[PDB]
Amino acid sequence: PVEVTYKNMRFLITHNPTNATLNKFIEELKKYGVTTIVRVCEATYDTTLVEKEGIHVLDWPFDDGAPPSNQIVDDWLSLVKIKFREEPGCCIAVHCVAGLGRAPVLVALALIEGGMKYEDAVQFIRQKRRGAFNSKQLLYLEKYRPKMRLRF
């Protein structure tokens, strides 16, 4: 599990925890200040124990190698501007089903929508995760034009 920050934002991509570690996961997650976790890939576990511990879990998927709707970008973008101004110092965890999968793509958007060019964000990310953004994803981010309503 890796982490990346920028301005008021600090994310944490992770690995789809098995039911076999959920108890430990929560402990890890809480040691980072993670308050929310977006699952963008198949859901493989209960959330009651998590939600039990003040950690909401939003479920907004989309097929890897596929642009995350238009709605999903809104919410993500909002969520990111809100949660961070609202909970100073908190982390937001995004996780996929396999491993990184498409999780970086979001974070990227978070960075792009924050005044970073897509490459500036791809590099900034591949700094933590050796290999991410398969050919297709690199295109999506490249084409992506920002709304840019993120105050800092």
Binding site: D46, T48, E51, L58, D59, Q71, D75
Partner: peptide, 9 residues
């Protein structure tokens, strides 16, 4: 009797 509910859209 628990599963993963929450979320919104």
């Amino acid at each position: 009797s628990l599963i993963p509910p929450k979320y919104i859209t």
